[PDB]
Amino acid sequence: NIKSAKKRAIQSEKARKHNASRRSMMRTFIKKVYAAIEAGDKAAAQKAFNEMQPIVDRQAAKGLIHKNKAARHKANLTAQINKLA
Amino acid sequence: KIRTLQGRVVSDKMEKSIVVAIERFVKHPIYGKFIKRTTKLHVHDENNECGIGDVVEIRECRPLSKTKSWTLVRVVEKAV
Amino acid sequence: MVTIRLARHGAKKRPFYQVVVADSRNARNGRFIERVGFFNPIASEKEEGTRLDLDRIAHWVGQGATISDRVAALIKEVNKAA
Amino acid sequence: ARYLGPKLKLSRREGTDLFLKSGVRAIDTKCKIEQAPGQHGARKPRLSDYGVQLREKQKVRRIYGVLERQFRNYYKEAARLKGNTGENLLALLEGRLDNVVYRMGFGATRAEARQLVSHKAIMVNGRVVNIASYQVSPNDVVSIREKAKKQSRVKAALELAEQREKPTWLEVDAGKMEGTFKRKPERSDLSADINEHLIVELYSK
RNA sequence: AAUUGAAGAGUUUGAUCAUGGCUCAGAUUGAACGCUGGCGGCAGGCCUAACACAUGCAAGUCGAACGGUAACAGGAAGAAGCUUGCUUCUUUGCUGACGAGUGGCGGACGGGUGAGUAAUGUCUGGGAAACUGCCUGAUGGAGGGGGAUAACUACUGGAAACGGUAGCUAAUACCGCAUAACGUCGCAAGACCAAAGAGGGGGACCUUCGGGCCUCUUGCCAUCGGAUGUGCCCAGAUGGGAUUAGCUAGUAGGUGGGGUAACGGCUCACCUAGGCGACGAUCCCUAGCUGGUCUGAGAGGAUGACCAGCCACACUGGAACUGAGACACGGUCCAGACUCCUACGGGAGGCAGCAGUGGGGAAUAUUGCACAAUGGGCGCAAGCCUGAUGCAGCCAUGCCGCGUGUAUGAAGAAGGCCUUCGGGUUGUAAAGUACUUUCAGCGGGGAGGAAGGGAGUAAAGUUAAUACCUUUGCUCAUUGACGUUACCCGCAGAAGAAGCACCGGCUAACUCCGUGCCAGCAGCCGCGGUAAUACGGAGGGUGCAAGCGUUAAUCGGAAUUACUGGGCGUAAAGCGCACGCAGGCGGUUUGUUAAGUCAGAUGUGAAAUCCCCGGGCUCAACCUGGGAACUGCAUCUGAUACUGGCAA
């Protein structure tokens, strides 16, 4: 409707696309981690955890994951590897 | 100190939890008669030491399940 | 933002402003944290016209509160005594 | 909002001189007082208990020229004030500005005093008050303005002020044509024949 | 100083006393209707169709973030009529600025409505497992690069709405890289995580002579605090129905995984078989809740329009996206009903914002003026926006104030009505006479709501700088929608200004005439069938008064649900009689506890409202200062007579 709501519509669409991509990459890295924990692999899962840590902290800082969630992930996953190793 | 309550165990049979009846003794607003009045509470206990018919003190904590925001401190008076 | 601001309470064509401390996104005559003085722009030429609790104002500006232009003008009017 | 009719008729239903035509002459002499308030006025009423209470309230209102919602508000204010509600009610009726202008001899009647008050001929404390029911505080000076000073009325009215009893709670002085309401009138300082317990009981039913 | 507070009557009977119902007298209202209507002040105004909506406004702003120039006005340069001295035209964002666009912030506030919700809500009191844009304090960082994409241009699809394709460009847009804590994870060892510039001014130096460089202001990032706001939990309280007694399988709990900002069946797998319920679950009807309002002596009863706090909703049903915050009134998506446009392929809309329409209804307002004030958004500010708000319009809808004159005046005029025809009454009423001008009308004068903001100085601070900026004084023009304002003065003349109900008893106030169980009246008792104080008219009176009556609704009276504060032999009312569980109550003495109870303290019980003492509007209504109050709850400290617990 005829306003500056049109601009918020198009910006929220653009940011929807950007956030969906970054959120999807973050979730795939976390799937790498506890999909490596599905098999009994310690150092493979540690390599995947070191691969996911900067991106989850980074998406926490960029403002789309709200860092406590960031913390939870790494906390949960650390538990999984010292349940395993 | 902490605010706590005292009550008696009304039933027992649940997996690391208990339920405690509290007896508050309140004056009727219109009639001016002091009337007994209960408050049943789902109360948590780790390792379920208290059985049925006990008397137990009880404090409030964070939620531990649906209702269940209460946890014991001291089991007294278990006498059967 | 919390704001020390005026809030219109008198009758029609006869305002009496009460200076309050509100969360700034409330209504004008709505919800406030505390009222802290008043300002009558008439009152008569008698004694006051305005009293205003400077200790609580200094407390809230210590907390981070902002002050509108009228309340700043009134503090610049009642400076310490006059 | 005020009466505007035959006055001596109101004074004749009550059976008592309500001072409604004080004016030039002496005691009525052309009223046929007591005799006939209407066509069947020669009949004795055999009045009820509601009739005596009502008729007492009407006596007081028809004296002071007050209508019912205003009188009723005076009863509420006299009730809430500390003390004796009959005496408080007469103290509220006696502090009226048109009454104080009548008591000082500035008007011949209370309606003439009410027209002096109404036609901006009266100041209190050096400010002109246009209002019949202004409530004169103690230690006030109420006077006539320079306009409507030395008009005939007030002079004649002061001429008939000496025929009356010179109220104790005033400073009547007619030289300068200014007066001082000094204190509230005591119940024993006014009129002696109105029964205010009847109007307390009238409003308390 | 803050509770000075309580009325009855009519009607059962031939009469009585009692019981008992019905009814009246009071106060109130978002009121409507009937008759009447002068002025002002302050308030209030769709209670019904959460029905459908024409039209106009209700949310924008910033160039001191960025590419840029669509206009407007200048500047520079060129050419021309050339009056060689002024105009016309053109290239240049060069400048003040600015359409469109990117970007930041706001559109989650403000404003509306009460549909749903009987307890995921509200009120009161506790709590822990939290997030928090803007605002504030502290500690520090703010280095070095890259790829894009709008706008723009060129085609192109479409009736339109709206797109598509190919190139170009910027940033405080976006992304890496470095850096790394008193940050995250980890027991540690360690691992890992961010950023953005812009503006004002300037001595010297270096200029690829655009600017580097210095300084100030402002912005960015990280962490820890604070304040505010929000999310979550518990206990108590907050309608009616037992002619609704069983309800519940993610249901109740546990373990582990996931999820959220955060605890949690929030979710899933497995294990246990619980959980709720006669202290009323479940079902059904109704309903937004509160501060409060009305009534009441009070306790209560009814209610929750305005004003303020909380919740919920935004055509209907659902969903998420962006964001600090929404599952979003003037956002997105889908579906549905309706309405509209169409080239028939498809599109568009959402007044329960403010005015306004149509409809519904007994009923409820202007398609107004202004951002001057107060507040909000944006902005360094100027300022722009603001149907919030300030005001104005209409309406006796309420409350309050004032007016319609005042004094005199007996020939007790005339006329009306009654009359025992003597007179009485209307009635000092009118007329006459003498005064006054409130308000309305006319003409002048004229506060206050105006504080700020702008432009020059002077001083101080900062600094390399006597710049720039900030602060404080001083000076100069100014800033009012209301508004021919409030108010003051002058003019002319009583001149423009009184109705409505009632008159048998209750209930204040009476006769005549007309009608004759009719016409009709009525709240109850009841009037009217020929001399009606009850019907209709007249005279007279009574009550209220710019109002007055009727109707609807609430409380009172009603001690007719009785807690205060009732009853049960015969008026209604003792189970047909017992036994007895849960429940209620419990002789007497001592000791202990101190739960009830009592006393004090602290925190809270929002503000307004009620009450008290004051203050301002000429008074009043109204506004307002301080107190009291909010009868409560929680915690701590005591007392121990009574009640309870425990022991004897």
mmCIF file with all atom_site columns, C-alpha atoms (C1' of nucleotides) in Angstrom, chain D residues 1-4 6-9 12-13 21-25 30-32 36-40 47-48 50-51 53 55 57-58 61-62 67-70 72-73 79-80 82-83 109 111-112 114-115 118-120 127-131 133-134 145 147 151 153 201 204-205, chain E residues 1-2 4 6-7 25-28 38 399-410 412 417-418 424-429 434-439 487-490 494 498 506-511 539-548 611-613 617-619:
data_model
loop_
_atom_site.group_PDB
_atom_site.id
_atom_site.type_symbol
_atom_site.label_atom_id
_atom_site.label_alt_id
_atom_site.label_comp_id
_atom_site.label_asym_id
_atom_site.label_entity_id
_atom_site.label_seq_id
_atom_site.pdbx_PDB_ins_code
_atom_site.Cartn_x
_atom_site.Cartn_y
_atom_site.Cartn_z
_atom_site.occupancy
_atom_site.B_iso_or_equiv
_atom_site.pdbx_formal_charge
_atom_site.auth_seq_id
_atom_site.auth_comp_id
_atom_site.auth_asym_id
_atom_site.auth_atom_id
_atom_site.pdbx_PDB_model_num
ATOM 1   C CA    . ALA D 1 1   ? -33.729 30.630 37.809 1.00 0.00 ? 1   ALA D CA    1
ATOM 2   C CA    . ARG D 1 2   ? -35.357 33.165 40.060 1.00 0.00 ? 2   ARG D CA    1
ATOM 3   C CA    . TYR D 1 3   ? -38.834 33.658 41.257 1.00 0.00 ? 3   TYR D CA    1
ATOM 4   C CA    . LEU D 1 4   ? -40.265 36.752 39.378 1.00 0.00 ? 4   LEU D CA    1
ATOM 5   C CA    . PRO D 1 6   ? -46.196 38.020 43.309 1.00 0.00 ? 6   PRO D CA    1
ATOM 6   C CA    . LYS D 1 7   ? -44.053 38.270 46.413 1.00 0.00 ? 7   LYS D CA    1
ATOM 7   C CA    . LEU D 1 8   ? -46.532 38.943 49.128 1.00 0.00 ? 8   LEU D CA    1
ATOM 8   C CA    . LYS D 1 9   ? -48.383 35.816 47.990 1.00 0.00 ? 9   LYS D CA    1
ATOM 9   C CA    . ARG D 1 12  ? -48.939 34.936 52.705 1.00 0.00 ? 12  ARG D CA    1
ATOM 10  C CA    . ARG D 1 13  ? -48.755 31.132 52.181 1.00 0.00 ? 13  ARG D CA    1
ATOM 11  C CA    . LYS D 1 21  ? -41.306 43.918 50.373 1.00 0.00 ? 21  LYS D CA    1
ATOM 12  C CA    . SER D 1 22  ? -39.406 45.873 52.985 1.00 0.00 ? 22  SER D CA    1
ATOM 13  C CA    . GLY D 1 23  ? -39.356 49.088 50.922 1.00 0.00 ? 23  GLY D CA    1
ATOM 14  C CA    . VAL D 1 24  ? -40.953 52.381 51.853 1.00 0.00 ? 24  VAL D CA    1
ATOM 15  C CA    . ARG D 1 25  ? -43.803 51.721 54.224 1.00 0.00 ? 25  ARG D CA    1
ATOM 16  C CA    . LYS D 1 30  ? -52.090 45.928 52.225 1.00 0.00 ? 30  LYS D CA    1
ATOM 17  C CA    . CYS D 1 31  ? -51.364 42.227 52.098 1.00 0.00 ? 31  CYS D CA    1
ATOM 18  C CA    . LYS D 1 32  ? -54.484 40.510 53.624 1.00 0.00 ? 32  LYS D CA    1
ATOM 19  C CA    . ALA D 1 36  ? -56.182 33.943 51.761 1.00 0.00 ? 36  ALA D CA    1
ATOM 20  C CA    . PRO D 1 37  ? -53.069 32.502 50.017 1.00 0.00 ? 37  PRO D CA    1
ATOM 21  C CA    . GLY D 1 38  ? -55.406 31.637 47.012 1.00 0.00 ? 38  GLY D CA    1
ATOM 22  C CA    . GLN D 1 39  ? -59.216 31.185 46.476 1.00 0.00 ? 39  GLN D CA    1
ATOM 23  C CA    . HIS D 1 40  ? -59.656 28.598 49.297 1.00 0.00 ? 40  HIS D CA    1
ATOM 24  C CA    . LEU D 1 47  ? -51.185 20.439 57.768 1.00 0.00 ? 47  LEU D CA    1
ATOM 25  C CA    . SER D 1 48  ? -49.336 17.105 57.826 1.00 0.00 ? 48  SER D CA    1
ATOM 26  C CA    . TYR D 1 50  ? -44.405 16.328 55.577 1.00 0.00 ? 50  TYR D CA    1
ATOM 27  C CA    . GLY D 1 51  ? -46.305 19.591 55.196 1.00 0.00 ? 51  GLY D CA    1
ATOM 28  C CA    . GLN D 1 53  ? -41.159 20.100 57.104 1.00 0.00 ? 53  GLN D CA    1
ATOM 29  C CA    . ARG D 1 55  ? -43.261 24.363 54.499 1.00 0.00 ? 55  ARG D CA    1
ATOM 30  C CA    . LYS D 1 57  ? -37.843 24.599 53.778 1.00 0.00 ? 57  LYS D CA    1
ATOM 31  C CA    . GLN D 1 58  ? -39.997 26.748 51.544 1.00 0.00 ? 58  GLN D CA    1
ATOM 32  C CA    . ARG D 1 61  ? -35.730 29.457 50.414 1.00 0.00 ? 61  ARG D CA    1
ATOM 33  C CA    . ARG D 1 62  ? -38.412 32.058 49.853 1.00 0.00 ? 62  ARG D CA    1
ATOM 34  C CA    . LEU D 1 67  ? -34.042 27.594 44.246 1.00 0.00 ? 67  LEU D CA    1
ATOM 35  C CA    . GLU D 1 68  ? -33.934 23.907 45.041 1.00 0.00 ? 68  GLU D CA    1
ATOM 36  C CA    . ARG D 1 69  ? -30.815 22.513 43.426 1.00 0.00 ? 69  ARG D CA    1
ATOM 37  C CA    . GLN D 1 70  ? -28.777 25.329 44.827 1.00 0.00 ? 70  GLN D CA    1
ATOM 38  C CA    . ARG D 1 72  ? -29.866 21.217 48.166 1.00 0.00 ? 72  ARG D CA    1
ATOM 39  C CA    . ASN D 1 73  ? -26.174 21.817 47.408 1.00 0.00 ? 73  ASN D CA    1
ATOM 40  C CA    . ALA D 1 79  ? -23.708 18.379 56.064 1.00 0.00 ? 79  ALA D CA    1
ATOM 41  C CA    . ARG D 1 80  ? -20.094 17.659 55.236 1.00 0.00 ? 80  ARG D CA    1
ATOM 42  C CA    . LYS D 1 82  ? -17.892 19.958 60.879 1.00 0.00 ? 82  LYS D CA    1
ATOM 43  C CA    . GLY D 1 83  ? -20.483 20.959 63.485 1.00 0.00 ? 83  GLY D CA    1
ATOM 44  C CA    . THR D 1 109 ? -34.982 43.985 49.866 1.00 0.00 ? 109 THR D CA    1
ATOM 45  C CA    . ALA D 1 111 ? -34.014 41.153 45.376 1.00 0.00 ? 111 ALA D CA    1
ATOM 46  C CA    . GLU D 1 112 ? -32.909 44.761 45.108 1.00 0.00 ? 112 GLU D CA    1
ATOM 47  C CA    . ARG D 1 114 ? -29.463 40.913 44.224 1.00 0.00 ? 114 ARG D CA    1
ATOM 48  C CA    . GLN D 1 115 ? -29.851 43.430 41.390 1.00 0.00 ? 115 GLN D CA    1
ATOM 49  C CA    . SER D 1 118 ? -26.035 41.485 39.609 1.00 0.00 ? 118 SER D CA    1
ATOM 50  C CA    . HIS D 1 119 ? -25.583 44.836 37.844 1.00 0.00 ? 119 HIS D CA    1
ATOM 51  C CA    . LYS D 1 120 ? -21.907 45.144 38.831 1.00 0.00 ? 120 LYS D CA    1
ATOM 52  C CA    . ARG D 1 127 ? -12.803 43.513 42.905 1.00 0.00 ? 127 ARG D CA    1
ATOM 53  C CA    . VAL D 1 128 ? -16.232 43.678 41.302 1.00 0.00 ? 128 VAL D CA    1
ATOM 54  C CA    . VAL D 1 129 ? -18.392 40.598 41.974 1.00 0.00 ? 129 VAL D CA    1
ATOM 55  C CA    . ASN D 1 130 ? -21.322 40.035 39.643 1.00 0.00 ? 130 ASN D CA    1
ATOM 56  C CA    . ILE D 1 131 ? -22.641 36.907 41.396 1.00 0.00 ? 131 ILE D CA    1
ATOM 57  C CA    . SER D 1 133 ? -24.214 33.601 45.593 1.00 0.00 ? 133 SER D CA    1
ATOM 58  C CA    . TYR D 1 134 ? -20.616 34.590 46.176 1.00 0.00 ? 134 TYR D CA    1
ATOM 59  C CA    . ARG D 1 145 ? -18.469 51.094 43.140 1.00 0.00 ? 145 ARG D CA    1
ATOM 60  C CA    . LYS D 1 147 ? -20.791 54.118 39.451 1.00 0.00 ? 147 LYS D CA    1
ATOM 61  C CA    . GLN D 1 151 ? -27.880 56.616 43.197 1.00 0.00 ? 151 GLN D CA    1
ATOM 62  C CA    . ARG D 1 153 ? -31.926 53.415 45.733 1.00 0.00 ? 153 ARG D CA    1
ATOM 63  C CA    . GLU D 1 201 ? -34.980 16.077 58.574 1.00 0.00 ? 201 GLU D CA    1
ATOM 64  C CA    . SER D 1 204 ? -32.606 13.268 55.434 1.00 0.00 ? 204 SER D CA    1
ATOM 65  C CA    . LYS D 1 205 ? -35.545 11.101 54.396 1.00 0.00 ? 205 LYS D CA    1
ATOM 66  C "C1'" . A   E 2 1   ? -8.502  17.357 60.026 1.00 0.00 ? 1   A   E "C1'" 1
ATOM 67  C "C1'" . A   E 2 2   ? -9.330  13.100 57.067 1.00 0.00 ? 2   A   E "C1'" 1
ATOM 68  C "C1'" . U   E 2 4   ? -21.719 13.748 61.835 1.00 0.00 ? 4   U   E "C1'" 1
ATOM 69  C "C1'" . A   E 2 6   ? -29.671 4.588  59.537 1.00 0.00 ? 6   A   E "C1'" 1
ATOM 70  C "C1'" . A   E 2 7   ? -37.479 7.772  58.618 1.00 0.00 ? 7   A   E "C1'" 1
ATOM 71  C "C1'" . A   E 2 25  ? -41.945 8.310  48.229 1.00 0.00 ? 25  A   E "C1'" 1
ATOM 72  C "C1'" . G   E 2 26  ? -34.948 8.783  47.203 1.00 0.00 ? 26  G   E "C1'" 1
ATOM 73  C "C1'" . A   E 2 27  ? -30.476 8.849  44.497 1.00 0.00 ? 27  A   E "C1'" 1
ATOM 74  C "C1'" . U   E 2 28  ? -28.415 7.707  39.725 1.00 0.00 ? 28  U   E "C1'" 1
ATOM 75  C "C1'" . G   E 2 38  ? -32.387 32.739 26.999 1.00 0.00 ? 38  G   E "C1'" 1
ATOM 76  C "C1'" . C   E 2 399 ? -23.122 19.250 36.206 1.00 0.00 ? 399 C   E "C1'" 1
ATOM 77  C "C1'" . C   E 2 400 ? -22.574 24.344 37.746 1.00 0.00 ? 400 C   E "C1'" 1
ATOM 78  C "C1'" . G   E 2 401 ? -23.376 29.705 37.482 1.00 0.00 ? 401 G   E "C1'" 1
ATOM 79  C "C1'" . C   E 2 402 ? -26.325 33.948 35.837 1.00 0.00 ? 402 C   E "C1'" 1
ATOM 80  C "C1'" . G   E 2 403 ? -30.677 36.262 33.506 1.00 0.00 ? 403 G   E "C1'" 1
ATOM 81  C "C1'" . U   E 2 404 ? -36.039 37.105 32.234 1.00 0.00 ? 404 U   E "C1'" 1
ATOM 82  C "C1'" . G   E 2 405 ? -35.737 43.265 36.034 1.00 0.00 ? 405 G   E "C1'" 1
ATOM 83  C "C1'" . U   E 2 406 ? -36.068 46.569 40.915 1.00 0.00 ? 406 U   E "C1'" 1
ATOM 84  C "C1'" . A   E 2 407 ? -38.771 49.794 44.403 1.00 0.00 ? 407 A   E "C1'" 1
ATOM 85  C "C1'" . U   E 2 408 ? -43.466 51.924 44.850 1.00 0.00 ? 408 U   E "C1'" 1
ATOM 86  C "C1'" . G   E 2 409 ? -48.407 51.322 43.665 1.00 0.00 ? 409 G   E "C1'" 1
ATOM 87  C "C1'" . A   E 2 410 ? -55.801 50.164 46.229 1.00 0.00 ? 410 A   E "C1'" 1
ATOM 88  C "C1'" . G   E 2 412 ? -58.256 46.580 46.231 1.00 0.00 ? 412 G   E "C1'" 1
ATOM 89  C "C1'" . C   E 2 417 ? -63.671 32.234 38.172 1.00 0.00 ? 417 C   E "C1'" 1
ATOM 90  C "C1'" . C   E 2 418 ? -66.642 31.361 42.558 1.00 0.00 ? 418 C   E "C1'" 1
ATOM 91  C "C1'" . G   E 2 424 ? -64.686 36.767 47.781 1.00 0.00 ? 424 G   E "C1'" 1
ATOM 92  C "C1'" . U   E 2 425 ? -60.503 35.671 44.796 1.00 0.00 ? 425 U   E "C1'" 1
ATOM 93  C "C1'" . U   E 2 426 ? -57.040 36.465 40.900 1.00 0.00 ? 426 U   E "C1'" 1
ATOM 94  C "C1'" . G   E 2 427 ? -54.071 40.596 43.624 1.00 0.00 ? 427 G   E "C1'" 1
ATOM 95  C "C1'" . U   E 2 428 ? -49.279 44.872 44.775 1.00 0.00 ? 428 U   E "C1'" 1
ATOM 96  C "C1'" . A   E 2 429 ? -50.727 41.173 40.647 1.00 0.00 ? 429 A   E "C1'" 1
ATOM 97  C "C1'" . A   E 2 434 ? -39.646 56.338 40.100 1.00 0.00 ? 434 A   E "C1'" 1
ATOM 98  C "C1'" . C   E 2 435 ? -34.952 53.673 39.277 1.00 0.00 ? 435 C   E "C1'" 1
ATOM 99  C "C1'" . U   E 2 436 ? -31.164 49.675 37.362 1.00 0.00 ? 436 U   E "C1'" 1
ATOM 100 C "C1'" . U   E 2 437 ? -28.587 47.637 32.837 1.00 0.00 ? 437 U   E "C1'" 1
ATOM 101 C "C1'" . U   E 2 438 ? -26.404 41.463 34.422 1.00 0.00 ? 438 U   E "C1'" 1
ATOM 102 C "C1'" . C   E 2 439 ? -26.480 38.605 29.893 1.00 0.00 ? 439 C   E "C1'" 1
ATOM 103 C "C1'" . C   E 2 487 ? -11.577 40.493 30.647 1.00 0.00 ? 487 C   E "C1'" 1
ATOM 104 C "C1'" . C   E 2 488 ? -12.298 46.089 30.847 1.00 0.00 ? 488 C   E "C1'" 1
ATOM 105 C "C1'" . C   E 2 489 ? -14.967 50.616 29.245 1.00 0.00 ? 489 C   E "C1'" 1
ATOM 106 C "C1'" . G   E 2 490 ? -18.907 53.309 26.608 1.00 0.00 ? 490 G   E "C1'" 1
ATOM 107 C "C1'" . A   E 2 494 ? -37.251 47.131 30.679 1.00 0.00 ? 494 A   E "C1'" 1
ATOM 108 C "C1'" . A   E 2 498 ? -40.910 30.833 31.334 1.00 0.00 ? 498 A   E "C1'" 1
ATOM 109 C "C1'" . C   E 2 506 ? -49.885 7.555  49.945 1.00 0.00 ? 506 C   E "C1'" 1
ATOM 110 C "C1'" . U   E 2 507 ? -48.213 13.197 48.561 1.00 0.00 ? 507 U   E "C1'" 1
ATOM 111 C "C1'" . A   E 2 508 ? -47.425 19.592 49.012 1.00 0.00 ? 508 A   E "C1'" 1
ATOM 112 C "C1'" . A   E 2 509 ? -51.927 21.682 46.652 1.00 0.00 ? 509 A   E "C1'" 1
ATOM 113 C "C1'" . C   E 2 510 ? -59.583 22.820 45.828 1.00 0.00 ? 510 C   E "C1'" 1
ATOM 114 C "C1'" . U   E 2 511 ? -64.019 24.526 43.742 1.00 0.00 ? 511 U   E "C1'" 1
ATOM 115 C "C1'" . G   E 2 539 ? -60.559 29.430 37.702 1.00 0.00 ? 539 G   E "C1'" 1
ATOM 116 C "C1'" . G   E 2 540 ? -57.419 28.831 41.870 1.00 0.00 ? 540 G   E "C1'" 1
ATOM 117 C "C1'" . G   E 2 541 ? -53.228 26.507 44.119 1.00 0.00 ? 541 G   E "C1'" 1
ATOM 118 C "C1'" . U   E 2 542 ? -48.849 23.294 44.803 1.00 0.00 ? 542 U   E "C1'" 1
ATOM 119 C "C1'" . G   E 2 543 ? -43.730 21.446 43.200 1.00 0.00 ? 543 G   E "C1'" 1
ATOM 120 C "C1'" . C   E 2 544 ? -39.714 22.078 40.178 1.00 0.00 ? 544 C   E "C1'" 1
ATOM 121 C "C1'" . A   E 2 545 ? -37.508 25.590 36.870 1.00 0.00 ? 545 A   E "C1'" 1
ATOM 122 C "C1'" . A   E 2 546 ? -34.351 26.363 31.163 1.00 0.00 ? 546 A   E "C1'" 1
ATOM 123 C "C1'" . G   E 2 547 ? -36.068 22.961 32.229 1.00 0.00 ? 547 G   E "C1'" 1
ATOM 124 C "C1'" . C   E 2 548 ? -40.070 19.673 33.474 1.00 0.00 ? 548 C   E "C1'" 1
ATOM 125 C "C1'" . C   E 2 611 ? -12.212 12.165 52.095 1.00 0.00 ? 611 C   E "C1'" 1
ATOM 126 C "C1'" . C   E 2 612 ? -9.466  16.426 54.860 1.00 0.00 ? 612 C   E "C1'" 1
ATOM 127 C "C1'" . C   E 2 613 ? -6.721  21.135 55.087 1.00 0.00 ? 613 C   E "C1'" 1
ATOM 128 C "C1'" . C   E 2 617 ? -10.522 30.474 37.610 1.00 0.00 ? 617 C   E "C1'" 1
ATOM 129 C "C1'" . U   E 2 618 ? -15.476 37.175 39.663 1.00 0.00 ? 618 U   E "C1'" 1
ATOM 130 C "C1'" . C   E 2 619 ? -18.185 32.305 42.506 1.00 0.00 ? 619 C   E "C1'" 1
#
